[PDB]
């Protein structure tokens, strides 16, 4: 119990210094513009934001883990989560089994559970993959833009009699052949123009044997902001999870190995939690922004009628500098969090095995982000590697920025228990 | 865990030293790892940093004249430091970045003929 100030001071002389740097206005106003600068790395930066990468790498995890499993993963049914008699639906731009499509044709099972997923479900799936993969290809912008948008483009396409994935009714589409319809949802409005086209089995060049509808959605105004884009990983992770379907895979030979070879998607219980949990503290990070920005940092302070400073009445300021200094350590050590989560040096035995072996390769024969190519499956095709690699760097180079911070923190926090 | 720093000393200008930190398994294992200096009437300053891949980077007022190093197998991080000034003095301590919060007792230097 230190009861006299010069003892306590005598102990802990860097107490003595964040008094002393407390009380001088222009100390004060040094660790503010720091302040303003540290944002800007975070938030205004790219490739030197921790914060940025640690986006990346969230997107960036959820994105590959599909890469991995899709092709194994059985999918089929009809429009209402019912099963089917004979029914195939392909999803293009999507890594199958030596192919840029994946087919659903599970006939009979029920979808759902350890199950085919059902073409619902596959659906939502596809449209969150299809705008990740647009978004990653085109580069994800910094955490303070968030009205920037991205156009995406997908096609499915249904063969078999009574499929009835591609009718008006699952499409909303009038005329099956040529018909096309446009909506709009919801504080940003995105428009979707989806449109059918019937093939004949004998028509021109049809290369399959027999007769399909063509699905094209075409989505315009899609955010491609960090929280709208982890909220597309989000609907991706969750709706595998939840809808837990069977699948089995083709381990190579020299390959890295598969354990299990046939299973249900959720099953992978780490792997899934934790690219939840990369998510979850990916929002928690990408929701510091606001904070801020609401309290920027730029105004200088000072006594007021030229008379000194006083840190007991002067410093109304303080609150909003420390809820600035702490939203941007939380972000940082957000940011920390999310790569050791992922980052294999600290996992062990199977789930260890999935990233090293399966999550953070690639097979394509590097081709730019969000490339889906016949040789994609069972391989995670979204940098993840790299991206840790490239969070740890710009960890590092943030060194001094985060002890201004920390020394910022301080001050503020000095300067709000004096004002008590 | 924790954080050990050792071998700091008096030593003369233009001379060498050379300081070792060792970390616990959960601090340092697939962390960026770095060292920090408190100096009379300064708060705490940054100095170097590493990554798990050992990339090195610097604070400009020791860049060209201290090293930093790691060895991944046995959890030690090192900072080798050479033509040293009396600008120098300070605790030395080392910390993963982002820092855990409880730091090490540091080691000091000092430089002065």
């Known amino acids: 119990n230190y009861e006299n100030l010069s003892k306590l001071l005598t102990r802990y002389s860097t107490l003595n210094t964040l008094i002393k740097l407390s009380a001088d206005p222009s100390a004060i106003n040094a660790a503010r513009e720091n302040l303003g600068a540290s944002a800007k790395n975070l938030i205004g930066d790219t490739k030197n934001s921790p914060a940025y990468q640690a986006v990346l790498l969230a997107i960036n995890a959820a994105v590959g883990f599909w890469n991995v499993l899709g092709y194994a993963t059985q999918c089929g049914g009809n429009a209402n989560g019912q099963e089917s008699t004979s029914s195939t639906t392909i999803f293009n731009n999507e890594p199958g089994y030596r192919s840029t499509s994946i087919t659903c044709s599970l006939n009979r099972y029920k979808p759902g559970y350890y199950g085919p997923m059902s073409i619902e479900n596959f659906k939502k799936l596809n449209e969150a993959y299809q705008i990740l993969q647009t978004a990653l290809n085109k580069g994800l912008p910094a955490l303070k833009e968030n009205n920037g948008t991205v156009s995406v483009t997908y096609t499915y396409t249904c063969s078999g009699e009574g499929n009835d994935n591609c009718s008006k009714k699952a499409t909303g589409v009038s005329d099956q052949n040529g018909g096309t319809k446009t909506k709009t949802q919801t504080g940003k409005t995105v428009t979707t123009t989806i449109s059918s086209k019937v093939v004949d089995s004998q028509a021109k060049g049809n290369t399959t044997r027999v007769s399909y509808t063509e699905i094209t959605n075409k989505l315009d105004g899609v955010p491609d902001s960090a929280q709208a884009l982890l909220a597309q990983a989000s609907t991706l992770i969750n709706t595998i999870n939840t809808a837990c379907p069977y699948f089995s895979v083709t381990n190579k030979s020299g390959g890295p190995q598969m354990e299990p070879t046939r299973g249900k998607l959720c099953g992978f219980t780490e792997e899934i939690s934790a690219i939840q949990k990369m998510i979850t503290d990916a929002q928690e990070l990408v929701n510091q922004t606001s904070v801020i920005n609401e309290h920027e940092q730029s105004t200088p302070v000072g006594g007021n009628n030229g008379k000194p400073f006083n840190p007991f009445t002067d410093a109304s300021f303080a609150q909003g500098m420390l809820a600035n200094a702490s939203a941007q350590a939380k972000m940082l050590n957000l940011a920390h969090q999310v790569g050791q989560t992922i980052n294999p040096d600290n996992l062990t035995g199977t789930f260890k095995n999935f990233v090293t072996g399966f999550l953070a390769t690639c097979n394509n024969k590097g081709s730019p982000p969000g490339t889906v190519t016949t040789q994609t499956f069972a391989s995670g095709c979204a940098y993840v590697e790299q991206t840790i690699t490239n969070l740890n760097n710009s960890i590092a180079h943030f060194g001094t920025q985060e002890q201004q911070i920390q020394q910022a923190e301080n001050i503020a926090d000095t300067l709000v228990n004096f004002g008590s | 865990v924790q954080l050990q720093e050792s071998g700091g000393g008096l030593v003369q200008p233009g001379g060498s030293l050379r300081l070792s930190c060792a970390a616990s398994?959960?601090?340092?294992?697939?962390?960026?790892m770095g060292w920090y200096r408190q100096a009379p009437g300064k708060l705490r300053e940054w100095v170097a940093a590493?990554?798990?891949?050992?990339?090195?980077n610097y604070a400009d007022s020791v860049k060209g004249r201290f090293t930093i190093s790691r060895d991944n197998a046995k959890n030690m991080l090192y900072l080798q430091m050479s033509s040293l000034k009396p600008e120098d003095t300070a605790l030395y301590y080392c910390?993963?970045?982002?820092?855990?919060?409880?730091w090490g007792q540091g080691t000091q230097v000092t430089v002065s003929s």
């Open positions: 398994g959960s601090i340092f294992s697939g962390n960026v």
């Open positions: 590493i990554t798990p891949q050992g990339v090195p």
């Open positions: 910390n993963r970045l982002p820092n855990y919060r409880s």
